[PDB]
Design an enzyme around this catalytic site. Structure first.
Site, mmCIF file in Angstrom:
data_model
loop_
_atom_site.group_PDB
_atom_site.id
_atom_site.type_symbol
_atom_site.label_atom_id
_atom_site.label_comp_id
_atom_site.label_asym_id
_atom_site.label_seq_id
_atom_site.Cartn_x
_atom_site.Cartn_y
_atom_site.Cartn_z
ATOM 1 N N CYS A 73 3.334 -7.387 -41.780
ATOM 2 C CA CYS A 73 4.592 -8.262 -41.170
ATOM 3 C C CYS A 73 4.164 -8.775 -39.876
ATOM 4 O O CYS A 73 3.575 -8.064 -39.153
ATOM 5 C CB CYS A 73 5.915 -6.905 -41.042
ATOM 6 S SG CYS A 73 7.138 -7.690 -40.511
ATOM 7 N N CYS A 148 12.396 -0.931 -41.824
ATOM 8 C CA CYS A 148 12.217 -1.715 -40.643
ATOM 9 C C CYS A 148 12.454 -0.647 -39.564
ATOM 10 O O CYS A 148 13.902 -0.664 -39.185
ATOM 11 C CB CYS A 148 12.666 -2.956 -40.498
ATOM 12 S SG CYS A 148 12.446 -3.779 -39.046
ATOM 13 N N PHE A 280 21.093 -20.201 -15.476
ATOM 14 C CA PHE A 280 20.843 -20.327 -16.941
ATOM 15 C C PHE A 280 21.620 -18.945 -17.448
ATOM 16 O O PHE A 280 21.134 -18.118 -17.642
ATOM 17 C CB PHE A 280 19.291 -19.970 -17.220
ATOM 18 C CG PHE A 280 18.232 -20.897 -16.494
ATOM 19 C CD1 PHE A 280 18.136 -22.137 -17.439
ATOM 20 C CD2 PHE A 280 17.852 -20.522 -15.403
ATOM 21 C CE1 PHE A 280 17.278 -23.122 -16.514
ATOM 22 C CE2 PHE A 280 17.064 -21.710 -14.670
ATOM 23 C CZ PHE A 280 16.667 -22.757 -15.149
ATOM 24 N N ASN A 285 25.888 -12.897 -19.326
ATOM 25 C CA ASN A 285 25.119 -11.454 -19.508
ATOM 26 C C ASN A 285 25.139 -10.811 -18.238
ATOM 27 O O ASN A 285 25.563 -9.548 -18.051
ATOM 28 C CB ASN A 285 23.881 -11.444 -20.156
ATOM 29 C CG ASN A 285 23.080 -10.286 -20.080
ATOM 30 O OD1 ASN A 285 23.695 -9.525 -20.760
ATOM 31 N ND2 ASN A 285 21.790 -10.155 -20.202
ATOM 32 N N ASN A 328 22.841 -29.817 -16.354
ATOM 33 C CA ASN A 328 21.474 -29.768 -16.666
ATOM 34 C C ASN A 328 20.373 -29.314 -15.806
ATOM 35 O O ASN A 328 20.234 -29.914 -14.838
ATOM 36 C CB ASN A 328 21.000 -31.499 -17.172
ATOM 37 C CG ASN A 328 19.727 -31.533 -17.655
ATOM 38 O OD1 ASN A 328 18.928 -30.777 -17.865
ATOM 39 N ND2 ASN A 328 19.551 -32.808 -17.970
ATOM 40 N N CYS A 375 10.508 -14.273 -19.574
ATOM 41 C CA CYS A 375 9.707 -13.592 -20.458
ATOM 42 C C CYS A 375 8.335 -14.336 -20.450
ATOM 43 O O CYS A 375 7.788 -14.227 -21.588
ATOM 44 C CB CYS A 375 10.491 -14.299 -21.869
ATOM 45 S SG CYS A 375 10.822 -16.051 -21.704
HETATM 46 S S1 SF4 Z 1 9.346 -2.329 -38.101
HETATM 47 FE FE1 SF4 Z 1 10.143 -4.216 -38.897
HETATM 48 S S2 SF4 Z 1 9.332 -6.000 -37.600
HETATM 49 FE FE2 SF4 Z 1 7.754 -4.313 -37.156
HETATM 50 S S3 SF4 Z 1 6.537 -4.366 -38.835
HETATM 51 FE FE3 SF4 Z 1 8.002 -2.907 -39.598
HETATM 52 S S4 SF4 Z 1 9.127 -4.549 -41.025
HETATM 53 FE FE4 SF4 Z 1 8.231 -5.784 -39.505
#
Ligand code: SF4
Ligand SMILES: [Cl-]
Ligand code: NI
Ligand code: NI
Length: 417
Positions: A73, A148, A280, A285, A328, A375
């Site tokens: 993944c 996940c 921004f 937030n 902008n 970021c």
């Molecule tokens: S935790 Fe989720 S995002 Fe991370 S490798 Fe596993 S499936 Fe992929």
């Protein structure tokens, strides 16, 4: 073909960094100070790549990946590195770039932290199977996601049940993607699909969401969003109740986001007479929590739909001292009428490119404190130089561990006179 190496460093992106015959080697799956027999299939000018064939030794910071899809993944890069190591390696890179120590690391749960995911869907006509998951590393191919562990547990639990429901649809071959979102108000499912759904398919989806207590939205194209069930969603954060549209952007890591906002407020040391500018600002937030402390707050944002949601959420939270402007931010906005009362404090949270043309604009405003959330540490570092040249110093610097196990490197800096 086959050579022995030692990894010196763990880079932002989770590959081990080694040297052989004086050339830099990037090896996935290898950690600082581990040794390995490795092979290069990729030899270039300034660097080379290699894969581990046999790892000879183990770092004490080595963990067992919690996800069975890790290594395949594209979503995670560093589950094999302990959280301390990830934080230490990112903090070191940030400190080197900024020429300043990292004051703190802002973090939350290393697992179960993502409050939304977009699962791609792809139909395989030769086997009549539906794929549902995420893109593979360096490919457009989909890894079927069954687990996940980075996803919020409510969302992770839904994965096999969503899969069996979509796999039951006649329209299986004409599905685009499915977004799952967890909010204080409830769990939301958005199915993007490519042609009209039959009534048998709509009924399956209705019964499924109804059984699971989910709010269901269908998106037949890029603009239309049909509510099948649900009321306007909302989440609670930093003392406020914030409505959002299921298309609208909300932050992925709820916990780290709330801590970032709280910390930014402590850093800005907002006074009751302060006038604050939030650049921004999105749907507010930082802006709306700033208005609970300041005399008045101005937010500036480039998407009108976000400016309108900021205004709505201000009203809903009884914030009468905040104004949102659509501008902008690539053009000169010290010209504007809202600039002239001036600002004591400024917060900005731009995208990857940074705020280059904006730094001189902030300087003209002469805030006594500035908080900059970034970021992209490379652009942060370039923009910092301008503030340093104009008499600000780095008062505080934090690494924000917003996406554990990935290569992201978010940061926040307080500049003051
Ligand atoms: S935790 Fe989720 S995002 Fe991370 S490798 Fe596993 S499936 Fe992929
Ligand atoms: Cl969408
Ligand atoms: Ni979508
Ligand atoms: Ni210092």
């Amino acid at each position: 073909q086959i050579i022995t190496v030692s990894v010196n460093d763990l880079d932002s992106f989770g590959q081990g960094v080694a040297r052989h015959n004086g050339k830099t080697l990037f090896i996935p799956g290898l950690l600082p100070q581990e040794n390995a027999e490795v092979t290069v299939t990729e030899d270039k000018k300034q660097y080379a790549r290699a894969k581990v064939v046999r790892r000879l030794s183990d770092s004490p910071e080595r963990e067992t990946p919690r996800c069975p899809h890790f290594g395949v993944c594209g979503g995670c890069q560093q589950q094999h590195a302990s959280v301390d190591l990830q934080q230490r390696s990112k903090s070191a890179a940030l400190a080197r770039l900024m020429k300043h120590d990292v004051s703190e690391v802002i973090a939350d749960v290393p697992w179960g932290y993502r409050r939304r995911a977009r699962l791609s869907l792809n139909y395989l006509p030769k086997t009549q199977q539906l794929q549902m998951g995420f893109r593979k590393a360096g490919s457009s191919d989909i890894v079927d996601v069954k687990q996940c562990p980075i996803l919020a547990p409510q969302l992770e639990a839904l994965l096999p049940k969503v899969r069996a429901c979509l796999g039951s649809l006649q329209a299986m071959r004409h599905l685009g993607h499915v977004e799952l979102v967890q909010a204080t108000s409830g769990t939301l499912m958005i199915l993007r699909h490519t042609a009209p759904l039959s009534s048998a398919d709509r009924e399956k989806l209705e019964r499924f969401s109804h059984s699971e207590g989910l709010d269901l939205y269908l998106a037949p194209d890029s603009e239309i969003l049909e509510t099948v069930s649900g009321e306007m969603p909302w989440y609670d954060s930093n003392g406020l109740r914030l409505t959002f549209s299921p298309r609208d952007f909300i932050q992925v890591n709820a916990g780290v986001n709330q801590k970032m906002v709280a910390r930014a407020l402590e850093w800005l040391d907002v006074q009751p007479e302060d006038r604050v500018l939030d650049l921004f600002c999105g749907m507010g937030n930082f802006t709306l929590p700033l208005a609970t402390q300041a005399a008045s707050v101005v937010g500036v944002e480039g998407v009108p739909a976000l400016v309108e949601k900021g205004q709505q959420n201000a009203r809903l939270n009884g914030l009468q001292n905040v104004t949102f402007y659509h501008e902008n931010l690539e053009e000169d906005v010290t010209k504007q009428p809202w600039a002239k009362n001036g600002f004591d404090k400024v917060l900005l949270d731009p995208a990857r490119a940074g705020a280059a043309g904006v730094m001189q604009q902030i300087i003209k405003l002469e805030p006594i404190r500035i908080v900059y959330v970034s970021c992209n540490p490379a652009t942060l570092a370039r923009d910092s130089e301008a503030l340093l040249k104009a008499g600000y110093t780095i008062a505080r610097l934090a690494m924000l561990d917003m996406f554990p196990h990935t290569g992201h490197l978010e940061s926040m800096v307080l500049f003051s006179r």
